[PDB]
């Protein structure tokens, strides 16, 4: 089906404690495949998925060069932003950056992105036409005008429609066993007594990939949206994901409740019942 590749960059200034901390990670879909950490001993871009390890020293040398250059621009950006927002030398601040591309289920270019946040808040983003910029702040306007005059969006359009999706497709092919797989959720229910008159019914989905999933409870086929406790999908640590959804079931009423699981790895959606 559909796929994406994304790179995430965080830079955090540390006044009086040296250079800003910089961390870059890259993902294809929900699978991390590279990392750089400016505090770490190696100073190299490093593999985080087995399928990227057989790329070759030209790859590792080049990506280490490019990632270090990203670290350096963010190091300038922090000083630049502090100037724009008239902020003191003393505080720690955060620049985040994300870019990358989606392909549709034909594997052709679908959507491109490139956006920045400052201190947890949208700063500037490339619009979907990849030709113009969204900026909310007055300070961000200085950036927008700089980028318009330097034709950064033209440069980014070229990369997102060409190189970005070409390398996504290469990775999809090279990592076919890991990236073009699905792991269907292995499911179960638990039942714990709150008190004498009700019990919590929890529907579990475990070891699934990719992360996208819908877990819902119905009672006589009516959706129980407002009475369902739902936790955030969470990583198992081994490349799979986990989720649960729970409802409070009054005594004798277990039979009215169904849990509904939708996931790409399932041959049909599951309807589960405590029985």
């Amino acid at each position: 089906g559909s796929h994406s590749m994304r790179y995430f960059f965080t830079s955090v200034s540390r006044p009086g404690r040296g250079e800003p901390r910089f961390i870059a990670v890259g993902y294809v879909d929900d699978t991390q495949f590279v990392r750089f950490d400016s505090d770490a001993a190696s100073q190299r871009m490093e593999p985080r998925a087995p399928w990227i390890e057989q790329e070759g020293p030209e790859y590792w040398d080049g990506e280490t060069r490019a990632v270090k250059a990203h670290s350096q621009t963010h190091r300038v950006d922090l000083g630049t932003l502090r100037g724009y927002y008239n902020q003191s030398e003393a505080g720690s601040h955060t620049v985040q950056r994300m870019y990358g591309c989606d392909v549709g289920s034909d594997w052709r270019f679908l959507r491109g992105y490139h956006q920045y946040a400052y201190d947890g808040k949208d700063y500037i983003a490339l619009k979907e036409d990849l030709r113009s910029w969204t900026a909310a702040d007055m300070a961000a306007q200085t950036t927008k005008h700089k980028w318009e005059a330097a034709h950064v969006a033209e440069q980014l359009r070229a990369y997102l429609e060409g190189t970005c999706v070409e390398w996504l497709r290469r990775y999809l092919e090279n990592g076919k066993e890991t990236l073009q797989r699905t792991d269907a959720p292995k499911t179960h229910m638990t039942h714990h007594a709150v008190s004498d008159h009700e019990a919590t019914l929890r529907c579990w989905a475990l070891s699934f990939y990719p992360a996208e999933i819908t877990l819902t409870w119905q009672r006589d086929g009516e959706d129980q949206t407002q009475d369902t406790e739902l936790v955030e999908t969470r990583p198992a640590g081994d490349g799979t994901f986990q989720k649960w959804a729970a409802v409070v079931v009054p005594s004798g009423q277990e039979q009215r409740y169904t849990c509904h699981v939708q996931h790409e790895g399932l041959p049909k959606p599951l309807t589960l019942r405590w029985e």
């Binding site: 955090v12 985040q96 947890g120 929890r202 955030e232 969470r234 990583p235 198992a236 640590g237 081994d238």
Partner: protein
């Protein structure tokens, strides 16, 4: 400036079975800024050999990290995750419940 509280889940990689080796995970997410302190506890004491994932972030810019250590559950041992962050006025401890 923007400060968002970490959500915290403490759990095992595989269904916990006594005597079988596993990973204990503390997942922290939705937080800003990124300086966070996360420890795994065994019977209240800091587990030394604890690793974390590489810092990354969601579409709304809030950070997430998985903290993890190898462990083999027993019937008696109690595990927990203790988190401190600027949004928290004291470290929040979440106990591992092998039904959650």
């Amino acid at each position: 400036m923007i400060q968002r509280t970490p959500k915290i889940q403490v759990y095992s990689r595989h269904p916990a079975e006594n005597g079988k080796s596993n990973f204990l995970n503390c997942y922290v997410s939705g937080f800003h800024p990124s300086d966070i302190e996360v420890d795994l506890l065994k019977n209240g004491e800091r587990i030394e050999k604890v690793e974390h994932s590489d810092l990354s972030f969601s579409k709304d810019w809030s950070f997430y990290l998985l903290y993890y250590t190898e462990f083999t559950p027993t019937e008696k041992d109690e595990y927990a995750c203790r988190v401190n962050h600027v949004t928290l006025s004291q470290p929040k401890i979440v106990k591992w419940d092998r039904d959650m």
